[PDB]
Amino acid sequence: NQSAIDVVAEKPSVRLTPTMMLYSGDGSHLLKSGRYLQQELPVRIAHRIKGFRSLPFIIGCNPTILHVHELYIRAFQKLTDFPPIKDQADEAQYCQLVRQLLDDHKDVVTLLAEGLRESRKHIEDEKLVRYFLDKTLTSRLGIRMLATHHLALHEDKPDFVGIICTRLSPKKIIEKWVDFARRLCEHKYGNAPRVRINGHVAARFPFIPMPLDYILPELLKNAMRATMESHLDTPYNVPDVVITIANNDVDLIIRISDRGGGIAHKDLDRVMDYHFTTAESGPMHGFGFGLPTSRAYAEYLGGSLQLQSLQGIGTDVYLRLRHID
Amino acid sequence: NQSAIDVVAEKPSVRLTPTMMLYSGDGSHLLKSGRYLQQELPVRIAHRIKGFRSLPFIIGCNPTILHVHELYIRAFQKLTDFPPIKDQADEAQYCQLVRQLLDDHKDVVTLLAEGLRESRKHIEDEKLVRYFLDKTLTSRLGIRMLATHHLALHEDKPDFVGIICTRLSPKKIIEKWVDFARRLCEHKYGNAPRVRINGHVAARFPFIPMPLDYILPELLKNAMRATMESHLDTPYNVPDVVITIANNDVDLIIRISDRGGGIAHKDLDRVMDYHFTTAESGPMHGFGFGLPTSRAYAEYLGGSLQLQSLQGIGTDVYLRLRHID
Ligand SMILES: Nc1ncnc2c1ncn2[C@@H]1O[C@H](COP(=O)(O)OP(=O)(O)O)[C@@H](O)[C@H]1O
Numbered sequence: 001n002q003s004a005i006d007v008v009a010e011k012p013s014v015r016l017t018p019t020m021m022l023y024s025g026d027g028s029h030l031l032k033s034g035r036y037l038q039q040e041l042p043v044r045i046a047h048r049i050k051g052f053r054s055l056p057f058i059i060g061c062n063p064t065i066l067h068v069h070e071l072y073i074r075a076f077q078k079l080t081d082f083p084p085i086k087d088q089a090d091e092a093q094y095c096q097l098v099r100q101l102l103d104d105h106k107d108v109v110t111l112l113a114e115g116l117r118e119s120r121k122h123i124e125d126e127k128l129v130r131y132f133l134d135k136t137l138t139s140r141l142g143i144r145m146l147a148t149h150h151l152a153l154h155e156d157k158p159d160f161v162g163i164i165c166t167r168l169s170p171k172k173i174i175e176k177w178v179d180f181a182r183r184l185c186e187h188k189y190g191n192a193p194r195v196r197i198n199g200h201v202a203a204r205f206p207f208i209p210m211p212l213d214y215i216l217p218e219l220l221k222n223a224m225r226a227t228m229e230s231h232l233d234t235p236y237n238v239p240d241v242v243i244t245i246a247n248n249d250v251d252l253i254i255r256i257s258d259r260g261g262g263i264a265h266k267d268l269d270r271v272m273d274y275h276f277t278t279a280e281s282g283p284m285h286g287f288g289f290g291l292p293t294s295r296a297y298a299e300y301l302g303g304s305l306q307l308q309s310l311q312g313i314g315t316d317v318y319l320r321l322r323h324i325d
Numbered sequence: 326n327q328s329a330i331d332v333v334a335e336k337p338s339v340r341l342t343p344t345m346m347l348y349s350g351d352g353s354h355l356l357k358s359g360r361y362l363q364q365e366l367p368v369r370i371a372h373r374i375k376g377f378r379s380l381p382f383i384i385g386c387n388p389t390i391l392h393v394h395e396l397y398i399r400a401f402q403k404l405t406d407f408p409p410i411k412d413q414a415d416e417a418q419y420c421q422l423v424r425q426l427l428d429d430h431k432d433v434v435t436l437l438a439e440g441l442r443e444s445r446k447h448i449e450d451e452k453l454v455r456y457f458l459d460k461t462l463t464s465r466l467g468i469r470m471l472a473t474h475h476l477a478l479h480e481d482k483p484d485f486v487g488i489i490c491t492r493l494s495p496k497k498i499i500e501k502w503v504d505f506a507r508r509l510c511e512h513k514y515g516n517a518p519r520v521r522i523n524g525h526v527a528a529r530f531p532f533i534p535m536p537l538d539y540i541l542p543e544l545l546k547n548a549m550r551a552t553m554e555s556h557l558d559t560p561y562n563v564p565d566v567v568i569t570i571a572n573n574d575v576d577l578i579i580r581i582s583d584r585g586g587g588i589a590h591k592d593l594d595r596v597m598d599y600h601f602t603t604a605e606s607g608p609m610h611g612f613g614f615g616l617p618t619s620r621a622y623a624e625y626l627g628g629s630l631q632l633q634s635l636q637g638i639g640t641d642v643y644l645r646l647r648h649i650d
Pocket residue numbers: 218222223226258260261262263267271276277278279285286287288289290291292314315
């Protein structure tokens with residue numbers, strides 16, 4: 001293949017700590033972060049190309065997998081073609097290409113999922129798919145956070161330093177997604193469980209909302225769907241979904257407790273697999289991607305996603321996310 | 326040491342399944358189970374003697390450890406000294422010695438804990454203590470269940486076949502221990518949290534109450550103590566402890582949720598260690614034995630004990646126990 005890709009495929013990624021990113025938030029500082037972004041993005045793309053190069057041959061040949069592999073190759077070429085950024089006039093043109101990188105192929109995850117599905121007969125290990133997709137989703141989230149933060153540092157949005165909210169309220173972001181999920185749930189069933197929020201309802205701290213924007217509506221949909229499917233005989237009299245916020249120095253805990261009947265013993269070892277579902281762009285919602293994506297996201301952010309199933313009663317879902325400090 | 330002990334130290338234990346025990350429940354059947362008990366108890370004792378023989382020399386020399394090792398040796402001799410049971414008149418005398426085995430040295434666990442504490446400087450691994458005590462507590466529970474079930478098969482107690490309750494109500498046994506724990510909690514603080522029980526409150530099924538008689542008051546004490554210690558400023562206005570019963574075909578789930586502030590991040594990897602406590606006969610209550618003993622018990626019964634800490638808010642404790650069928 002291409003030798004420029006070979007040069008950085010093994011080069012370790014360099015990450016700016018969220019603490020270092022709030023520290024910078026600008027004229028002279030933007031130049032330093034700009035040069036950094038320029039050295040970093042081709043490395044992230046090269047890492048993904050190495051992923052495709054490492055797939056078993058039979059899987060890497062899948063025309064959809066091959067097409068996605070090609071998209072990554074073309075993306076790397078465009079990023080390395082740009083000369084070193086000297087003046088802010090070039091950075092505006094480079095932002096047009098980072099915006100183009102971010103906008104042109106947002107459906108890569110969907111394409112990969114299709115490619116891996118078409119290749120299932122040649123995949124003996126469910127571990128290979130989970131490992132490949134976990135890496136794909138986390139690296140694409142890292143690329144998205146890296147790029148979107150640099151682009152947002154141009155803007156003067158209140159309570160934000162790039163993509164970092166200086167005073168995020170978990171109650172507010174949960175409420176925003178509760179309203180979204182309830183409206184969709186009411187459209188399907190003619191009713192939706194009421195959502196009660198308790199615990200540290202006044203908590204506010206520096207945090208990045210972007211991954212919560214994927215995780216929260218997914219977990220809310222899961223809890224609401226399980227509640228409605230469990231109470232189809234009394235659809236206008238369903239138990240509440242209860243959300244607890246626990247805020248301490250180390251982490252933020254969001255517990256989502258439903259009375260949806262639980263996750264059956266037979267399904268428990270399968271719910272964390274991609275494509276496993278009992279229901280009938282970027283990271284996709286639906287088709288059994290919800291739980292594995294949310295877990296890959298939480299773990300990449302230094303936290304976790306844990307489930308406690310009470311078969312016959314309901315499920316408690318624990319989302320833990322590490323504080324910025 | 327003694328050659329009779331050597332003969333059965335490696336002989337695999339033979340366990341009667343709880344299903345097989347309800348199946349038998351008597352004149353002719355008692356003889357079959359009686360002969361079985363006779364072949365089995367010396368094997369269980371020999372296994373414990375092998376545990377002492379296998380301890381590092383420096384630990385096995387501890388005079389308290391040595392004394393407990395001796396008690397096991399003397400117990401084995403008494404069990405093998407008895408001739409094969411022919412008539413039920415001898416079984417009455419053998420029950421007097423099983424009752425003597427069960428009554429004379431109920432404080433063995435306490436003595437072992439003292440011996441291992443005195444030997445801490447020569448113990449490099451906390452894993453050695455956890456592994457030794459887990460094995461000691463589970464094997465002593467197995468010996469107690471084996472012996473007490475055979476002795477109880479003589480009695481005609483309603484709703485029981487030996488130690489197996491044919492229609493145990495988890496709500497009833499939880500309520501019994503709630504009343505016990507509340508009275509003790511009121512004596513220490515002048516108040517106790519109210520305990521609410523919800524979920525499958527009408528569940529009744531075959532089960533063995535004996536291990537729940539250790540686990541439930543321990544977990545209730547933990548939840549009540551954490552709640553009172555967290556609300557010392559308002560001791561007569563404390564949040565309720567909420568217990569959920571979930572009954573399905575596979576297992577029984579008892580979730581104990583408190584608003585006791587949680588288990589601190591610094592203590593989380595230590596709460597499951599013997600002697601770890603922040604508070605200031607058979608299996609002992611107190612001195613940091615609660616959680617490791619309850620977990621060893623739940624796992625030995627085919628279930629588990631899992632904790633979810635919400636630091637700043639409270640803790641959810643999940644006790645899972647496998648159904649008899
Ligand atoms: N709260 C819940 N209660 C019951 N079942 C659930 C719950 N959350 C998830 N599940 C189960 O896990 C499966 C996988 O969930 P998920 O990965 O989010 O995918 P999807 O939402 O597309 O079905 C669901 O289809 C459902 O069977």
